[PDB]
Amino acid sequence: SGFRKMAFPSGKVEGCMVQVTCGTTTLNGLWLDDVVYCPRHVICTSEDMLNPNYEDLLIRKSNHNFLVQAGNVQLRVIGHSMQNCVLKLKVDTANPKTPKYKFVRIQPGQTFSVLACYNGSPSGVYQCAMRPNFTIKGSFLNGSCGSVGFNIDYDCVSFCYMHHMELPTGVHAGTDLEGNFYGPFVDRQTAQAAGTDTTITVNVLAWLYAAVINGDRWFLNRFTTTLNDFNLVAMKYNYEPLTQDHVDILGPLSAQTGIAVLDMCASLKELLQNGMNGRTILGSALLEDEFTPFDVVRQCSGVT
Amino acid sequence: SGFRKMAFPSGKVEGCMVQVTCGTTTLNGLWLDDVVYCPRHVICTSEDMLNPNYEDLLIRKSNHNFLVQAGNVQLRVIGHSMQNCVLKLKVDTANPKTPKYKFVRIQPGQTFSVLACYNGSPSGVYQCAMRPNFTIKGSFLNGSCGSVGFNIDYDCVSFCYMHHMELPTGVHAGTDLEGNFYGPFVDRQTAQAAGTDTTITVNVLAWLYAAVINGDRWFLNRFTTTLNDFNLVAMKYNYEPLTQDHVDILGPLSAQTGIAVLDMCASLKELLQNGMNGRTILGSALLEDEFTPFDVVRQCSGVT
Ligand SMILES: O=C(Cc1cc(Cl)ccn1)Nc1cncc2ccccc12
Ligand SMILES: O=C(Cc1cc(Cl)ccn1)Nc1cncc2ccccc12
User: Fold this and answer.
1) CATH no. for residue B250?
2) CA-CA distance, B183 to B162, in Å (whole number)?
3) Which one of A81, A194, A228, B18 counts the least CB within 10 Å of its CB?
4) Quick one: A180 and A215 in the same domain?
């Protein structure tokens, strides 16, 4: 029992972290097989970041200008290429610690673990969700760029995020491992609208099921609702509309607790309309949306 | 910017995890150098757990009864001994992945990362605090015993906790790496009083400084207080009394923000007396006490 904001064990990803330096800029890179992946803004100076012409900037750089260090040893760069907002530095040595991996583009509302790094050295690991507006509410400082987000299924690491930027609002933006930004963001030092965010309804419902599994049951009521009635409440409280696909993903949690999905929706409706009344659920005084239904079952069943 | 419940990267600890089986019981062990450390209740059957005579139970066991597996390879046990509530299984092979390590007994109110494991395989990592009453509010299922808590300083892992038991209340109890329980607990299946817990005042103050650093400032007020006046409030709200030693540990955060410790105490006093009024601080609707002053500076400065 107990429910924590649990991250995947980071060891497999720690073995892939390297430092990448170009000119006077240093950030993190991800070394998989014979390629190091890093944000393309490593080629910029502070004067370039206002509106960089990355193609022109990269043309002034040669393989020997990209300094890649894995711990204390230097990697030899034999090729470089820009793919969207990432650079791919081909090196002459395959990373001996390359785990089984995939590059995936996650959907908004899904979760992943972040291994925050500075100078190619891991500093910490935390779990977070990709917001519906494609930002992440991470914890990152200058030099964290190139830190990655991932999920792990047995021995396979699915990399889903590479950190690129902190928006003036203090929220974070980044790309998939092919260098495509999540959301409307561009790698420039300019104010950029993130757009209206919403609460991940399916995740709040999953977390309410996790609370019932772990003994926090005070919020259960004698009511039920419909998807239509619940979605009117969701609209008013800036929650994502619940669909049958979300109800289907909540199936296993519903069977475990014997609480029909629409009955749990009625509990969520009452919490939205009345608040918590100074009470807590799983050590929180707000409705938590950073746990997917898969996360709840994995944590409540013990997948390794 | 951003503030997360960040755990240490778990790689160095992942390399130490093994599975230990004795009879029909399997749990986790920690393999450091040529010794595997695990909870002594691995020698018990369910009939023994009501009140085990561990000395008698261990006398029936020989080196060959302790099955230790590191991934897919079997370790040869050449010695066994009980130290308090842990068994130390001497093996013929030093763990090649043994990091630089220390065994430390942490104080209540301090934090550490937990690498939750099942069958010697890591499942997840989370950060938590040792409660003032010596329990931990972890996330653990059957078979998690032997999972460890630790801190990392550059390349040295300081192991501070080994998971042993879930109390009937759903909270967790365990030992230091010499097998001494934190708190009054005994390794038996019996209801055991944990005793009155308190909120870790110095950690709440540290987290309020983290909020100011990250832009959440609505709770700052035009008031100040004294240690005496603040401690009357702390008494009423079941908070640990603040001492000059705690004020001294808050020094660096106080100098960073320019907010005197007693001025922040006045903000904490007002939050305790008035609540949050439906507002949040660093994504929380309650006062968070699982971040020490060291944690806040490490996260807000980027130590790797
Ligand atoms: O955002 C940037 C640099 C950069 C990259 C791009 Cl692609 C566009 C503009 N500027 N760096 C940072 C990332 N994450 C947290 C940071 C906290 C403080 C300072 C800097 C941080
Ligand atoms: O507590 C025990 C077993 C045990 C050990 C001792 Cl030392 C005394 C009594 N019983 N195991 C568990 C530990 N952590 C979370 C668990 C969640 C569910 C079931 C079992 C869990």
Assistant:
1) 1.10.1840.10
2) 13
3) A228
4) no
